[PDB]
Amino acid sequence: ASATRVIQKLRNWASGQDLQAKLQLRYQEIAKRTQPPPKLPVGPSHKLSNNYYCTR
Amino acid sequence: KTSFGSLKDEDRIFTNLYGRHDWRLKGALRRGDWYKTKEILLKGPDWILGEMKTSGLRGRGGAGFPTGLKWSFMNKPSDGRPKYLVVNADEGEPGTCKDREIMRHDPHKLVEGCLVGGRAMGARAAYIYIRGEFYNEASNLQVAIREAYEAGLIGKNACGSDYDFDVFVVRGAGAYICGEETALIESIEGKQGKPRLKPPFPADVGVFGCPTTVANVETVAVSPTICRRGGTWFAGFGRERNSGTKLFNISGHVNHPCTVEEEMSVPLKELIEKHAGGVTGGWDNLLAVIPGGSSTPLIPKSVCETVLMDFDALVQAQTGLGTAAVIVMDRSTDIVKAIARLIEFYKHESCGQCTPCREGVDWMNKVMARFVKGDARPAEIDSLWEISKQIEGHTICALGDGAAWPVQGLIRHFRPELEDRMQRFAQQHR
Ligand SMILES: Cc1cc2nc3c(=O)[nH]c(=O)nc-3n(C[C@H](O)[C@H](O)[C@H](O)COP(=O)(O)O)c2cc1C
Ligand code: SF4
């Protein structure tokens, strides 16, 4: 992403593809390495009634 | 007949219910006890059992089982073991004082009934297991028994009928579970008050491993009057299959809480408005009624308008007639708190032998305390219903059923009250 415009035009002409739109090196678009804590949902059997195991 | 109630004083059995006459032998003989009891005993076992059967008397204990069939379960030839009549005089159940009243006021009726039932079933003795807290009642019972022994009504010549019968009085030591049949048998035998499983039934293996029959004080006390006046009269009182008179203990939010004797199938509204002086604040101020002691569920005012006081009528009303203990709660009653206090009673009075009643009744007590505080969510209502259904029918004795039924009644009728308490708690905390 630090390539000069001359080298970018040279690479794009040599490959035939617009390489700068789809770079194979990740710079900033990736997720942050620290994330907010999750709160995972519970399954369908997490209920206090009508949940006898013989019926499922 | 179609309408029942308005029992006449000449037809009331317990003529000294209020202690206004002499409770001793002279007053009892003036009131008509111990009359032709020798002739009854010479008529013998089969005639007495037929009289009970044609009277159609059902168990005043709260079980509701027929008395004639239950007593004819012991109409068998002896296999060398002695046979025993055992009289449930514990009266542990809340709301109920009728056995106390008739023990301290008509004890000679109880003694004569012990003799009649023991002769009918074939028995050398009747052990009256009285409640441990009823010390004065037990002492009055012993005074009456000493009078009967001195008069020759009891002991080695039962009123001169060449029949030997002894009446013992054994005091409990404070356990509601000892009012149960088999637990009472164990308590007499000297162990803890833990009910034993059936089979064997007590008519086969009971107290001291002998054939025995446990019967309520009211049942035993109305036995000799039934024999004297015939079973057709007692069957003529009450509805079909719910026959005779009954001692009702009306307590709670009524103007005159009292013990009265009234015919079976009396309307509940009629009984309250006639003998209890009505609900405090009026029939519109009535909220709920527990009609058969704590073991029966509650019924709201809407079905209390027209319900009768029968076993079958209360079964149709999704209740039971237990000890005929009518506990009345008005609009100011914290109904959830009252039911939780009942569940706390059952938690303190469980004998702890068997797992569903032990663990589940403690669990239901904790859940009901949180319901009173509002500290739950409405899914726990259905959870508590399922816990009650797991307790009911899975226990050794019927204390589990008698603890599951009030919870079921509260959930069945006053569910929006529980949801409103939970919502108010939730909005006042969050
Ligand atoms: C937990 C429990 C407690 C009971 N407490 C009493 C009691 O205090 N007095 C009583 O007469 N019956 C009590 N009973 C009911 C007895 O089963 C009943 O009295 C006994 O079977 C006598 O039968 P009857 O109703 O035909 O006279 C209790 C039952 C249970 C399950
Ligand atoms: S139900 Fe309760 S009181 Fe009855 S035997 Fe079981 S533990 Fe004892």
Short mmCIF file of C-alpha atoms and ligand atoms in Angstrom, two decimals, chain B residues 177 195 349-355 357-358 395-400, ligand 2:
data_model
loop_
_atom_site.label_atom_id
_atom_site.label_comp_id
_atom_site.label_asym_id
_atom_site.label_seq_id
_atom_site.Cartn_x
_atom_site.Cartn_y
_atom_site.Cartn_z
CA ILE B 177 -46.53 -36.80 60.20
CA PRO B 195 -44.77 -44.08 57.35
CA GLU B 349 -43.36 -31.33 59.18
CA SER B 350 -42.01 -33.65 56.47
CA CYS B 351 -40.59 -36.81 58.01
CA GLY B 352 -37.79 -36.83 55.45
CA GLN B 353 -37.85 -40.56 54.75
CA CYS B 354 -38.47 -40.45 51.02
CA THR B 355 -36.69 -38.39 48.40
CA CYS B 357 -41.30 -35.20 49.53
CA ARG B 358 -38.04 -34.41 51.34
CA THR B 395 -44.09 -40.54 47.68
CA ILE B 396 -44.47 -43.17 50.36
CA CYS B 397 -47.30 -41.34 52.13
CA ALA B 398 -49.71 -38.56 51.24
CA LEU B 399 -47.83 -35.67 52.86
CA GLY B 400 -46.27 -35.13 49.43
S1 SF4 C 2 -43.98 -38.13 51.77
FE1 SF4 C 2 -42.61 -37.01 53.24
S2 SF4 C 2 -43.65 -37.33 55.26
FE2 SF4 C 2 -44.40 -38.99 53.85
S3 SF4 C 2 -42.97 -40.78 53.95
FE3 SF4 C 2 -42.15 -39.40 52.30
S4 SF4 C 2 -40.60 -38.13 53.43
FE4 SF4 C 2 -42.04 -38.97 55.02
#
